[PDB]
Amino acid sequence: VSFTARAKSNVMAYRLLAYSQGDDIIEISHAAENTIPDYVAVKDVDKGDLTQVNMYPLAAWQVIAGSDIKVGDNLTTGKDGTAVPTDDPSTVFGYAVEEAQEGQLVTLVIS
Amino acid sequence: MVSFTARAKSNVMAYRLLAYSQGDDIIEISHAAENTIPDYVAVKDVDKGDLTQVNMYPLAAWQVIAGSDIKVGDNLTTGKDGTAVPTDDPSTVFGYAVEEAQEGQLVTLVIS
Amino acid sequence: GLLSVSGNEDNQLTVKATVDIGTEDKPKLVVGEAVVSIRPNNASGGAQA
Amino acid sequence: TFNDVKTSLGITESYDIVNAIRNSQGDNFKSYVPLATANNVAEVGAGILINQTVQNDFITSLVDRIGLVVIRQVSLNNPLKKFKKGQIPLGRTIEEIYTDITKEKQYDAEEAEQKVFEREMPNVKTLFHERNRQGFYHQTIQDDSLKTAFVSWGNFESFVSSIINAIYNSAEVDEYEYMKLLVDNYYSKGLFTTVKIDEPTSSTGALTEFVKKMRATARKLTLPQGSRDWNSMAVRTRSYMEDLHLIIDADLEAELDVDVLAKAFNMNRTDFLGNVTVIDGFASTGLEAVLVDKDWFMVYDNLHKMETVRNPRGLYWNYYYHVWQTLSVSRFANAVAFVSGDVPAVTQVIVSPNIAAVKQGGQQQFTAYVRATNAKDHKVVWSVEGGSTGTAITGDGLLSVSGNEDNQLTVKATVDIGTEDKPKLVVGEAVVSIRPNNASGGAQA
Amino acid sequence: TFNDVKTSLGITESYDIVNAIRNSQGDNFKSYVPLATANNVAEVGAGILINQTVQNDFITSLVDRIGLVVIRQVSLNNPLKKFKKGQIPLGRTIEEI
Amino acid sequence: TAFVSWGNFESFVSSIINAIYNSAEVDEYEYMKLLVDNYYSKGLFTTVKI
Amino acid sequence: TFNDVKTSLGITESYDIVNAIRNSQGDNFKSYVPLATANNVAEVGAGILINQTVQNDFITSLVDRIGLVVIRQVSLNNPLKKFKKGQIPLGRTIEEIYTDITKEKQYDAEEAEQKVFEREMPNVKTLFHERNRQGFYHQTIQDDSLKTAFVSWGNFESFVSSIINAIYNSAEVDEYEYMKLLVDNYYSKGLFTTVKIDEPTSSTGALTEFVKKMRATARKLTLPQGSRDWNSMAVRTRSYMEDLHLIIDADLEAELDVDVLAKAFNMNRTDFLGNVTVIDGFASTGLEAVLVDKDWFMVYDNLHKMETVRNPRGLYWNYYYHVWQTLSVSRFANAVAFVSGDVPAVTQVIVSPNIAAVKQGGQQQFTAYVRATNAKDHKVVWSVEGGSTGTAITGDGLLSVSGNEDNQLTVKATVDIGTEDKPKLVVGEAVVSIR
Amino acid sequence: TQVIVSPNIAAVKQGGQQQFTAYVRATNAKDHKVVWSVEGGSTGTAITGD
User: Fold this and answer.
1) Taking CB atoms and an 8 Å limit, are C34 and D4 in contact across chains?
2) Distance of CA D152 to CAs D73, D160, G345, Å?
3) Measuring CA to CA, how many Å separate D323 from each of D136, D198, G145?
């Protein structure tokens, strides 16, 4: 299924997103650093632009890497919605099954 | 989906949040207790001694009875009788509203 | 506005769409109604996920 | 099946009409007193939604049967089907061609000794349209399941055709809103020649000024001499009075016909403001109304097929009606917006020739056409952006190509509006393809 | 003979209509939400100013051709041509008595 | 080399010829408009002051 | 759509013909210096892959159109079609039954005393051909969207025609590819009678040495004496000069016409006597020619039907041309391979009865035929599976006692290199049943 | 002398795939491995080797 989201502030593709609420429609912005994100952008979305959130429960995501990620590394939110390695449970939202440099997309399995 | 047999043990009502327990060689189900995270959602009335089934599937969203007025984006938890109510305590949040609901109306929810 | 029907619903419903206008201590309820006939499926429901 | 449904399903009564006729003591219901079966008409005269079954009065065991079955044939035309052009079977692209006028050239029989073969190029501007809409409509008719609602093949086949008509209606609903989008498109692009007004609903008089600015504009469009002032290409063209259409909101046209007394007795005239095509409001926030030409809508049809499928397992059909259309507008063909509230001072800079093949070392006169809403003169900064080889333009728009350019350069005509703190650089733009010449030179004098 | 050219050439987009229908939640663009091919109509529905080759949507190596060429025939008139008199073949002066 | 039909190749030539005929309408408007401004300049219009 | 594409898109130039005509002192381009439009021609001379929009020269606003559209209709055939046999509408397998000759027995009226009712079965051999190829060609024609790319109904129907003819030119190509697979399959199984010859294009005398090995062997095939050699199954068959076909390639064709068939005074004294089907070439690493019988190819048709359908939601027809086909070879008919390079010393070993039926305690003799590309490679070693400790193969004779397993007779020839004799060997097998 | 890439005129949807088929025109019998590469790309876009 899917639902309407109103964005919040300059969403970039492949970045980790988080939801909020304001006037009514759920607001979407880049997820804060060191936590668990809610959604992955598939395309760029302007600040106040309405769009859809495609809830097709995925077991794995394709997310832009914020730093050097190795295979099996536990991942959390980094800066600007990027994904980074973490050694602190609770910030973990998944783990990499691929190796990635920086700014490259990395496949990760959500857990 | 993956279906399995489960027995109600306390008058299961449709669109209510459900919990389960280990019973007499069978999973027994009932309305989820207040202020927690439910496991299953009813979609049929099943009385206290009635035997039914559960259809397993990672559903994106559930449609349940609102235990109170709900605003879009509200984090929800169990309430009285297995209904869904607004909250703010993360540990009891099982999903959130994507649509408005008045008490007694269905509210679509997205699992987290 | 999306009715979702239980897997063992067996009687005649009525949806209601209520616009509350008027006084806080006199709720003037304007209610539009529709009628739903529940027809069986014989599917194995129960619980999900 | 159903039960327990009364005649009051969804009905929120303001007063019970049957007490009022009963309790009528010289009241205003007193003419409903001599009616014999008054209490029966009040019960089910509003229609019945759910069809309760009714026993017969004389013989209770018999059931009173459904007599006539009326199938409604209500059709939904496009208001703008009269602006749609022909059909295009093959191809995709449409090409417009408009050949403009030229200058006058005094007869001089001494200058004619050498200026035979003088090479004046005609002033043709072209404009391209392609297919845009490509969509289908979809009904399933279960034929065998609908044979139980219908006892005669007249009423059965009439109902089948009323599902085909709902497909045909669904086309001219969406063709409306597509053609309604093109007005919302063209004004959002800034290609309308806007006419600033005050908000007409704010006062009478402000209405009366708005009918002045429409009656004056309408005669200016249909001047036979034509003008370069009212289209977004700024060629010299006219319109006709019968082919001029005032697309206006229903609420706004209601105000003018009652308050502005001159327009009142000029309804059923096709020539006071052209043909008023009342639609509902525009999605653009300021656009009050629009005068427009018949040749404005370059709306063409490409495909009208109703291909069909039959499911044997389901015992039904699928009716798939495809509508493919070119839905674009002509940047020729005079078109005027009427915009209330805040406008920019200058809405468009139309640069003549917007397309140029200019030789290395050659020249080309460009002209800007500043479409301002106020009555003010505005300075055109001509520029050459792009290119790599030092080509420059003069302050009036004569391009001078630098002899070995070999790079495509585009020519901009900037009209800064607003203040210097927020310079609102309304820019029109031409393009130039640089042709080689193999010429010598490099310095002059 | 042109290289890279846009469809927005002399276009001063006071607002973007694509982002207006996309970000619409009942603010007057609610009539365009059930409109199917809205983005492709508003893209090139202002009459592309400089032509660019469009490849065919099914077999990509083919060129979608120019189908119809509409040569406009606006006939400008002199509104005072009803005030013209006859034609004088020979001579120069008119004597009005 | 910009047409595939003679019926459209002829119709563009006629649009170039009728563009010349359209030019003789635009100027003739202006000269007959000038005769008004000549006559008011030379003062031979019977003037009503408004 | 295709924004910034050069005209020299997929082009690796060797020299710039613009500059070489321009540098006119190079005394080979001097005849192009008179040409006043040499730069315009040598730009779009090879053609344009991308169709940039060309503006009109006189009025820049106009666009130079397409004048003429040419559909390039091609019809390509199958060279090996004359080897097909027929069609088999009903039924699946093909059984082919051969009856070999017997062994002469000495007169011996002493031992004719007790053998009057001795039963002696013929050397009847069979092999089976199931239906192999079962495939279909898929072509979607999305016809209402192809109206945009044409402005006439003549070019439009001529283009739907060529898509349908493109579906038939696949059934002529892939049918040809499987039939050269049946030669590379057969050579990969080790089932040809391999003949050693150098590459004929090596020194032009090895071409002459190659024709000597083609007109020897093509005589050796059609001797009325017959032969146990020159085929798998090792039967004594003979063949006919008319029923011989040769395959060579277009390389041996032209070299023979230039180097041999033109110098020769009598062309019939050096004509590869057989029929020659000139083909592309074989995918095996050394296999140059294949000399073969007519009835070697067992290629039979089973189904050729076109099925169409229309999707009314996507406005397209969808053409399913089915081709079902029996594609096998016949081991009874002769087959010679003409192979350069290194070959194995023994190609295969043929165990002369392929299936037997022996009682508990019966007696079958088994026989080996070594193929032997060299002058001598011998010493068949005989073994048997089936794990019962009274059974024994010995030289030729099989003991086969009251053990009741489906045993198989595994023979061996040791093509080997020194201490590489642990892997290096060539076997042949038979299957022996009980009772 | 030439490396002919077979779908020269490719129109691929976002997230889609096209197979590319390089026909190297060699003037000998030597084999030459084709190295595939994408120019004009972003993150997420490459050719997988063959």
Assistant:
1) no
2) 18, 13, 89
3) 6, 40, 13
Alpha-carbon gap: G148 to the closest alpha carbon of chain D (Å): 4
How far is G350 from C26, CA to CA, in rounded Å? 105
Q: What is the resolution of this structure in A?
A: 3.2
Q: Render the burial of E23-61: b for 16+ CB within 10 Å, e for the rest.
A: bbeeeebebbeebebbeebbbbbbbbbbbbbbbbbbbbe
Cβ neighbours for D272, distance < 8 A, ≥ 6 positions apart:
D215, D218, D263, D266
d(CA G401, CA G391): 5
- E55 → closest Cβ in G1, G66, G142: G1
Touching subunits for chain B (3+ Cβ pairs under 8 A): A, C
Hey, are the CB atoms on D328 and E45 less than 8 Å from each other?
Answer: yes
Chains B/E: 3 or more C-beta pairs closer than 8 A? no
The residue of chain B nearest to residue C38, with distances taken between CA atoms, is B44
Question: Which residues are CB-contacts of G17 (< 8 A; sequence separation ≥ 6)?
Answer: G29, G42
Phi-psi region of H40 (alpha: psi -120 to 50; beta: other; left: phi over 0): left
Residues 50-79 of B with CB under 8 A from C: 52-59, 62-63
Sheet holding G408-413, edge to edge: G355-358, G426-434, G408-413, G381-384
Question: What is the least distance, in Å, from the CA of E60 to any CA of chain H?
Answer: 6
Q: How is residue D410 written in tokens? A: 């585009």
Phi, psi of A92, rounded to the nearest 5 degrees: -70, 125
**Angstrom distance (rounded) from CA H3 to CA D165:** 57
Q: A61, A87, A64: which is closest to A74 by C-alpha?
A: A87
What is the amino acid identity at position B57?
Y
For E24, the closest of A24, A46, A50 (CB atoms) is A50
* Solving technique: cryo-EM
Task: With CB atoms and an 8 Å threshold, state whether G10 touches H1.
Answer: no
- Side-chain half-sphere exposure of D125, counting CA atoms within 13 A: 22
Question: Phi-psi category of D386—alpha, beta or left, where left has phi over 0 and alpha has psi -120 to 50?
Answer: left
Q: C17 forms bridges with which residues in the sheet? A: C32
Residue B108 pairs in a beta bridge with: B63
- Whether D102 and F29 lie within 8 Å, measured CB to CB: no
Cα angle for residues G309, E59, H5 (degrees, 5° grid): 125
H contact chains, 3+ CB pairs < 8 A: A, E, G
Nearest CA in chain B to A59: B58
Angle at A105 between CA A100 and CA A106, to 5 degrees: 60
Tell me which residue of C29, C18, C48 sits closest to C4, measured CA to CA.
C48
Distance CA B39, CA B80 (A): 16
Taking CB atoms and an 8 Å limit, are G151 and F1 in contact across chains?
A: no
Cα within 13 Å of Cα(G264), Cβ side: 13
Q: Which residues of E touch F2 (CB under 8 A)?
A: none
Q: Do H5 and G9 touch (CB under 8 A)?
A: no
Contact criterion met (CB < 8 Å) for G149 and E64: yes
CB-neighbour burial class of residue D34 (10 A; exposed 0-12, middle 13-18, buried 19+) = exposed
Q: Is G292 exposed, middle or buried (0-12, 13-18, 19+ CB in 10 A)?
A: buried
Which of E13, E20, E77 faces D224 most closely, judged by CB atoms?
E77
Buried b (16+ CB within 10 A) or exposed e, A43-61: eebeeebbbebebeeeeeb
Minimum Cα–Cα distance from E9: chain D residue: D429
CA distance D96 to D126: 5
Alpha helices in G357-404 (DSSP H): none
